[PDB]
Amino acid sequence: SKAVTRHRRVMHFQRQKLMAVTEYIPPKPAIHPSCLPGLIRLLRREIAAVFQDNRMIAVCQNVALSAEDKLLMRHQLRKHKILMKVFPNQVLKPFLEDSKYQNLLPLFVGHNMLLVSEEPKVKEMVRILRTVPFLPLLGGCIDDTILSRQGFINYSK
Amino acid sequence: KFTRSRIPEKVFQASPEDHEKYGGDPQNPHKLHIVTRIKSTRRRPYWEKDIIKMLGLEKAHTPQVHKNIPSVNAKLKVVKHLIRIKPLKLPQGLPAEENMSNTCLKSTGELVVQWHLKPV
Amino acid sequence: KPKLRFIERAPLVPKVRREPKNLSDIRGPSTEATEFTEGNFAILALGGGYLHWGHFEMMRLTINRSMDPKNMFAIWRVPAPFKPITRKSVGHRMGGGKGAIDHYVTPVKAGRLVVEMGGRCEFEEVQGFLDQVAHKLPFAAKAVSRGTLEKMRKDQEERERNNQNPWTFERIATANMLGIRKVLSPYDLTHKGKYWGKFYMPKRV
RNA sequence: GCCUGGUGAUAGCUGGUUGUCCAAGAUAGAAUCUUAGUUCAACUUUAAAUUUGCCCACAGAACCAAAUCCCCUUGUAAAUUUAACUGUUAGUCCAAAGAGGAACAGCUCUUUGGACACUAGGAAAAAACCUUGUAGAGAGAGUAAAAAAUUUAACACCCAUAGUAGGCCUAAAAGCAGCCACCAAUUAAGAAAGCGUUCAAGCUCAACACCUCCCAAACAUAUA
RNA sequence: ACCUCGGAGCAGAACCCAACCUCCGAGCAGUACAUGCUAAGACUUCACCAGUCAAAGCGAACCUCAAUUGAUCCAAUAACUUGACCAACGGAACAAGUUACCCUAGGG
Ligand SMILES: [Mg+2]
Ligand SMILES: [Mg+2]
Ligand SMILES: [Mg+2]
Ligand SMILES: [Mg+2]
Ligand SMILES: [Mg+2]
Ligand SMILES: [Mg+2]
Ligand SMILES: [Mg+2]
Ligand SMILES: [Mg+2]
Ligand SMILES: [Mg+2]
C-alpha cells in the first residue's frame, strides 16, 4: 500500500501508541467557571413629555380588538383631543417612580394603552365601551389623585 | 527511507526548571556517567548495536562508568533511547588503594567506599 | 465578470510526456494559496484530494445557480486540471508500458482555499450553498470566512499553549525520543503528526 | 516389434544420502542459447603475517528533504594482507522514500533499515508486529512487552393595518412571472423571506404590545 | 514490441540502484598528419575482458564531439596492416515450420 491511500491507513502500533500518549489534554480549573459569579431616551423624553401634558389620564386592556375595530376606536377617540398610546410597561415602571406616582406603580402591567387627556369625553368613551361587553376601564389619575372606575362614573358623569 | 537521525542542539540545553527538577548544577558539572542498557538492540539499526558494543553495554541492567566528555556524549546521544544515564556521585572521596576492595555502587547513583553489612 | 469562468477539461497545449503519480502533491499542508486575496469567504480544504473536471462543474454550476452577481463575485484559486492521470485499457494484463492519458486533475492539499467569494454579502448568506459545495467535494472541506479562519488559527494556538500534556509529537519526533523515527516518516518531523496520508487531524495538537 | 549387446547410455530434472558433541556462519552484482544452471565477484570459513579498523569534529564536496561522503579526537577491538577452498542468492514481510497497477491484491519493481529462514515472553491462534537474545541445574527474586475506549439532534407563545391592486412590461400578473426604486404613516409590520393562487383572496417569517450456530463468563463503588 | 552503446528522471546532497518504467539519442562526421616513441602515478560501469587519465623523458612544433562500437580462432598480406547489422551486439564456422499421435523428466 502506498503512503497516500484512499482509506485511512492502519498505523504501526508504536505510531498509534505515540498518537495516544501525545493527545491533547485541556486544562482543568479547580472550580468550574460557570459555578462562579436612543429609542430608550426617545420613550423617556416622549412619554415624560406626556406626563407633564395631561391633566387627566385613563387606561384599558386594549388588546381585545381587531385592526379595523381599533381603527374605529382610534377615530371615535380622534373625535376628541384624547390620545391613545401603546408603549412597553418595561420602561413605564421606571417612568412612574420618576414621576412620583407611588399609587400608580401597581397599575401598569400586561397589555395596556394610555388615554391621556385634558378634556373628559371619557363618559362618552364609556358610552362607546358599553356596547362592547368586555374591555373594562382600568383606573386613572387626574392631577395626582387616583380615579377608580367608580371615580370614572363620578367624574365622567 | 529510514536513516540515521541527527538531533538538534536545543535538545541538549538545560533550563533552570530542569535544574530544579533533577539535581544538577550547570557550574561544576559531574565527571563520570553511569550508563545502563535498559532496552534491547534487537529491532534497532546496526549502528546502535555497534555503539552499544563500544560503550560496553552488551549486558542489560549492568552499570558502566564513562567520562562526561563530548566524544562519549556523542556516542551516548546516538543510543540515548536504549540506556539510562545518571551522574556518578561520590559522597566520600574516590577510593584509595586501601578502600579499593571494599566498595559498593548503590542504587542511588553514589559509590560508597566503605561497605560494611551492619545496620547503622 | 462576477461569476465562475468556465474551467476546461484539459488545456489547449497538451502534455505528451506521461507523469508519475507523485501523491505527495496531496500530502501535507498546502503552501500555495492559503490566505485570502481580495476575498471575504472561501471553501477551505480540510484535507487533500484530486479535483476532476466534474468537480469543477459541480462548483461552477451549483454556485452560479445560487448567486447574486450584483451582490457577490467569486474567483477560482485552484488552477485548471493539469496533472495527466492515465488508465490502462479495461481488463488487460500487466506490464507493456504505462497506460495512455485518460483525464486531467488538479491536486489540492489541506489548508488550500479553492473558491474565493466577495462583495456586499454576510457570511450566513453564503454558508448554505458553500456547505453544499463543500460536501460535494472529494476531500473534507468547509466554508470559511476571514474572521472564522483567524478564529480557528487562534484556536490552534490556544490548543498548543493550553495543553497539560508534557509529551507532544514534536518533542518526541524531533528528539528521536523512544527511538521512534524507525516508525515515523521524515515528513512527520515537519507535519508534526497532524497529517496522516492525505487526511488532516484538526483535533490533534 | 521384441531380445541381447554398446550400457553403470545420458539426465542443468525428481527422489535419496547412515555415529556423537562443540564452534564460526544468510541477501551487492556481472556475463551466459542465460534466468530449474554455471563462471567470476560479493558474503561466508580456516590457517598465517602484519598494522590499524570501527565510532567519528572542525574544515571540505556545483552549477543548471531525511541524510551521505570525508574525518582527528574519543570509545573500543578489530582490520588489512598472504595461503587454501567449499557453499548461498526470484528471498518473505513490516517501517520509510518511490515507480507500474485501480493511491486493488498474501500484485509487480527499486532504495534505506529492521525482523524472519536462530531463543523465549506477549499480541486469541500467529514466519516477518512488540519485548528479548549466548545457551546448565534450582520447589528463589526483580522486571520487560502486555487488558480497547465510545452513545448521539425538543424549542422562542404571540402577531400583522395603512400610501397600494408600487409603477412599467404584462389579458391582469398586486411583496410574491420579470426590470427598477426600495421612500413612507402611526409606537410599529419588508414595496417583502418561505406556502399559495391565471390574477386575486387567503397562510407562516422578521417587527410591534408580556418577556451451518451469538460467541469467554462476567462486572459501573475498598485507596496503585 | 524488444535484445548493444550513451544522456536525463526515477535515484533532490559521495558512489551504486530495477522495471514489457518515463523521455531523448548512437551505430558518424570533420580537422589534422609528431593522431611520434616512451613512462611515474592513478581512475574504472560493481568480477573478468575491455575501457579511461597522465607528469617527467627522447623527438619535434613554437584533436572536436557523449554514444559514434565487436573478443578468440581463422583468413588475406613480403611486411605494416585489414577482415562481420558475428545488431540474438561476451559473438556456436554453417541448421525452418509443426504434432488433438506426440514421448520422457519435471514445475504449477
Ligand atoms: Mg545417472
Ligand atoms: Mg542437464
Ligand atoms: Mg553458534
Ligand atoms: Mg551466445
Ligand atoms: Mg538449468
Ligand atoms: Mg584517517
Ligand atoms: Mg570495479
Ligand atoms: Mg545471444
Ligand atoms: Mg549477449
mmCIF file of C-alpha atoms in Angstrom, chain A:
data_model
loop_
_atom_site.group_PDB
_atom_site.id
_atom_site.type_symbol
_atom_site.label_atom_id
_atom_site.label_comp_id
_atom_site.label_asym_id
_atom_site.label_seq_id
_atom_site.Cartn_x
_atom_site.Cartn_y
_atom_site.Cartn_z
ATOM 1 C CA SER A 1 0.000 0.000 0.000
ATOM 2 C CA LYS A 2 1.238 3.480 -0.894
ATOM 3 C CA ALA A 3 1.894 6.250 1.613
ATOM 4 C CA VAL A 4 -1.162 8.163 0.371
ATOM 5 C CA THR A 5 -4.233 5.924 0.224
ATOM 6 C CA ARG A 6 -7.964 6.468 -0.230
ATOM 7 C CA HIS A 7 -8.816 4.948 3.157
ATOM 8 C CA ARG A 8 -7.193 5.916 6.448
ATOM 9 C CA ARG A 9 -4.218 3.584 6.553
ATOM 10 C CA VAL A 10 -3.620 1.482 9.659
ATOM 11 C CA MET A 11 -0.732 2.896 11.642
ATOM 12 C CA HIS A 12 2.151 0.893 13.028
ATOM 13 C CA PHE A 13 1.355 0.026 16.622
ATOM 14 C CA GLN A 14 4.046 2.234 18.141
ATOM 15 C CA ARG A 15 2.905 5.033 15.823
ATOM 16 C CA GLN A 16 -0.561 4.573 17.322
ATOM 17 C CA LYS A 17 0.792 4.469 20.878
ATOM 18 C CA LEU A 18 2.675 7.741 20.226
ATOM 19 C CA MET A 19 -0.525 9.270 18.885
ATOM 20 C CA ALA A 20 -2.420 8.191 22.014
ATOM 21 C CA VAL A 21 0.204 9.296 24.515
ATOM 22 C CA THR A 22 0.597 12.695 22.887
ATOM 23 C CA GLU A 23 -3.121 13.516 22.790
ATOM 24 C CA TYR A 24 -4.315 16.992 23.750
ATOM 25 C CA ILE A 25 -5.069 17.426 27.444
ATOM 26 C CA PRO A 26 -7.233 20.508 28.191
ATOM 27 C CA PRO A 27 -6.646 22.446 31.444
ATOM 28 C CA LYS A 28 -8.995 21.734 34.330
ATOM 29 C CA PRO A 29 -9.560 24.586 36.821
ATOM 30 C CA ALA A 30 -10.084 23.668 40.482
ATOM 31 C CA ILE A 31 -13.509 25.315 40.352
ATOM 32 C CA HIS A 32 -15.681 25.132 37.266
ATOM 33 C CA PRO A 33 -16.003 28.726 35.952
ATOM 34 C CA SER A 34 -19.761 28.583 35.322
ATOM 35 C CA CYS A 35 -20.239 27.813 39.030
ATOM 36 C CA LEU A 36 -18.718 31.209 39.957
ATOM 37 C CA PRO A 37 -20.162 34.770 39.816
ATOM 38 C CA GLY A 38 -31.581 56.150 21.734
ATOM 39 C CA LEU A 39 -35.085 54.743 21.317
ATOM 40 C CA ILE A 40 -34.999 54.322 25.120
ATOM 41 C CA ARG A 41 -34.429 58.066 25.646
ATOM 42 C CA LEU A 42 -36.959 58.715 22.847
ATOM 43 C CA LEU A 43 -39.534 56.971 25.047
ATOM 44 C CA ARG A 44 -38.209 58.743 28.167
ATOM 45 C CA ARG A 45 -38.460 62.216 26.592
ATOM 46 C CA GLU A 46 -41.683 61.455 24.690
ATOM 47 C CA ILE A 47 -43.718 59.794 27.443
ATOM 48 C CA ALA A 48 -42.130 62.072 30.084
ATOM 49 C CA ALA A 49 -43.481 64.953 27.980
ATOM 50 C CA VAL A 50 -46.854 63.153 28.036
ATOM 51 C CA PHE A 51 -46.637 63.107 31.874
ATOM 52 C CA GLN A 52 -46.481 66.913 32.097
ATOM 53 C CA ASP A 53 -49.036 67.347 29.275
ATOM 54 C CA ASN A 54 -52.104 65.531 30.605
ATOM 55 C CA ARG A 55 -54.282 66.790 33.450
ATOM 56 C CA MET A 56 -56.346 63.569 33.347
ATOM 57 C CA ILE A 57 -55.268 60.034 32.384
ATOM 58 C CA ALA A 58 -57.056 56.715 31.845
ATOM 59 C CA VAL A 59 -56.022 53.271 30.585
ATOM 60 C CA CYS A 60 -57.593 49.976 29.451
ATOM 61 C CA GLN A 61 -56.560 46.481 28.286
ATOM 62 C CA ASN A 62 -56.670 47.358 24.591
ATOM 63 C CA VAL A 63 -55.523 44.022 23.140
ATOM 64 C CA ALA A 64 -59.003 42.543 22.784
ATOM 65 C CA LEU A 65 -59.857 44.212 19.442
ATOM 66 C CA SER A 66 -59.425 43.776 15.692
ATOM 67 C CA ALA A 67 -57.419 46.069 13.396
ATOM 68 C CA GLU A 68 -60.367 47.903 11.822
ATOM 69 C CA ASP A 69 -62.060 47.866 15.244
ATOM 70 C CA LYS A 70 -59.018 49.637 16.718
ATOM 71 C CA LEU A 71 -59.353 51.967 13.714
ATOM 72 C CA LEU A 72 -62.956 52.667 14.777
ATOM 73 C CA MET A 73 -61.824 53.252 18.372
ATOM 74 C CA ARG A 74 -58.964 55.399 17.019
ATOM 75 C CA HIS A 75 -61.404 57.548 15.026
ATOM 76 C CA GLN A 76 -64.061 57.798 17.752
ATOM 77 C CA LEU A 77 -61.373 58.971 20.179
ATOM 78 C CA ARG A 78 -59.851 61.061 17.361
ATOM 79 C CA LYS A 79 -63.184 62.924 17.599
ATOM 80 C CA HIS A 80 -61.774 64.080 20.961
ATOM 81 C CA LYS A 81 -58.353 65.567 21.761
ATOM 82 C CA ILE A 82 -57.672 62.464 23.888
ATOM 83 C CA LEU A 83 -54.685 60.365 22.781
ATOM 84 C CA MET A 84 -54.135 56.601 22.883
ATOM 85 C CA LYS A 85 -50.635 55.209 23.397
ATOM 86 C CA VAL A 86 -49.387 51.631 23.010
ATOM 87 C CA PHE A 87 -45.981 51.547 24.709
ATOM 88 C CA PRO A 88 -43.974 48.985 26.749
ATOM 89 C CA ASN A 89 -44.556 48.833 30.505
ATOM 90 C CA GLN A 90 -40.912 47.657 30.674
ATOM 91 C CA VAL A 91 -39.855 51.314 30.546
ATOM 92 C CA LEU A 92 -43.092 52.606 32.142
ATOM 93 C CA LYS A 93 -42.316 51.021 35.526
ATOM 94 C CA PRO A 94 -39.286 53.363 35.931
ATOM 95 C CA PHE A 95 -41.464 56.121 34.412
ATOM 96 C CA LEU A 96 -43.907 56.104 37.334
ATOM 97 C CA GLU A 97 -41.248 56.301 40.079
ATOM 98 C CA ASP A 98 -39.636 59.146 38.095
ATOM 99 C CA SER A 99 -42.985 60.993 38.005
ATOM 100 C CA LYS A 100 -43.585 60.336 41.757
ATOM 101 C CA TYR A 101 -46.538 58.001 41.168
ATOM 102 C CA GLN A 102 -46.499 55.600 44.109
ATOM 103 C CA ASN A 103 -50.235 54.823 43.884
ATOM 104 C CA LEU A 104 -49.739 54.168 40.137
ATOM 105 C CA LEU A 105 -46.841 51.671 40.486
ATOM 106 C CA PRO A 106 -49.469 48.840 40.953
ATOM 107 C CA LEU A 107 -51.303 49.775 37.791
ATOM 108 C CA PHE A 108 -49.254 49.294 34.632
ATOM 109 C CA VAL A 109 -48.624 45.692 33.596
ATOM 110 C CA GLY A 110 -49.654 43.453 30.699
ATOM 111 C CA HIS A 111 -51.425 44.822 27.634
ATOM 112 C CA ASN A 112 -52.399 48.456 28.181
ATOM 113 C CA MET A 113 -52.878 51.648 26.158
ATOM 114 C CA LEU A 114 -52.846 55.214 27.508
ATOM 115 C CA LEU A 115 -55.829 57.565 27.138
ATOM 116 C CA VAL A 116 -54.062 60.803 28.017
ATOM 117 C CA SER A 117 -56.356 63.820 28.039
ATOM 118 C CA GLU A 118 -57.086 67.359 29.185
ATOM 119 C CA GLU A 119 -60.828 67.348 28.351
ATOM 120 C CA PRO A 120 -63.066 64.473 29.574
ATOM 121 C CA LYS A 121 -65.078 62.800 26.847
ATOM 122 C CA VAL A 122 -64.486 59.685 28.956
ATOM 123 C CA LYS A 123 -68.197 59.415 29.783
ATOM 124 C CA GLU A 124 -68.898 59.247 26.040
ATOM 125 C CA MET A 125 -65.915 56.898 25.735
ATOM 126 C CA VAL A 126 -67.728 54.717 28.314
ATOM 127 C CA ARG A 127 -70.798 55.140 26.065
ATOM 128 C CA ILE A 128 -68.690 53.595 23.292
ATOM 129 C CA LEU A 129 -67.419 50.878 25.676
ATOM 130 C CA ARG A 130 -70.904 49.908 26.938
ATOM 131 C CA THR A 131 -71.870 48.490 23.521
ATOM 132 C CA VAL A 132 -68.956 46.011 23.686
ATOM 133 C CA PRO A 133 -69.291 43.525 26.596
ATOM 134 C CA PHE A 134 -65.588 43.493 27.502
ATOM 135 C CA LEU A 135 -62.525 45.782 27.639
ATOM 136 C CA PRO A 136 -63.009 47.325 31.120
ATOM 137 C CA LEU A 137 -61.874 50.720 32.369
ATOM 138 C CA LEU A 138 -58.623 50.450 34.339
ATOM 139 C CA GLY A 139 -58.124 53.174 36.962
ATOM 140 C CA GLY A 140 -56.537 56.522 36.080
ATOM 141 C CA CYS A 141 -55.121 59.534 37.911
ATOM 142 C CA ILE A 142 -56.191 63.142 37.409
ATOM 143 C CA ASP A 143 -53.704 65.663 38.941
ATOM 144 C CA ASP A 144 -52.016 63.234 41.422
ATOM 145 C CA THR A 145 -55.422 61.903 42.519
ATOM 146 C CA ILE A 146 -56.331 58.318 41.618
ATOM 147 C CA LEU A 147 -59.570 57.508 39.761
ATOM 148 C CA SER A 148 -61.207 54.167 40.403
ATOM 149 C CA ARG A 149 -63.821 53.095 37.847
ATOM 150 C CA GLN A 150 -66.427 54.276 40.373
ATOM 151 C CA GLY A 151 -64.474 57.560 40.295
ATOM 152 C CA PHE A 152 -64.728 57.396 36.491
ATOM 153 C CA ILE A 153 -68.517 57.159 36.886
ATOM 154 C CA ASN A 154 -68.490 60.125 39.299
ATOM 155 C CA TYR A 155 -66.018 62.353 37.430
ATOM 156 C CA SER A 156 -67.125 61.282 33.936
ATOM 157 C CA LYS A 157 -70.782 61.851 34.853
#
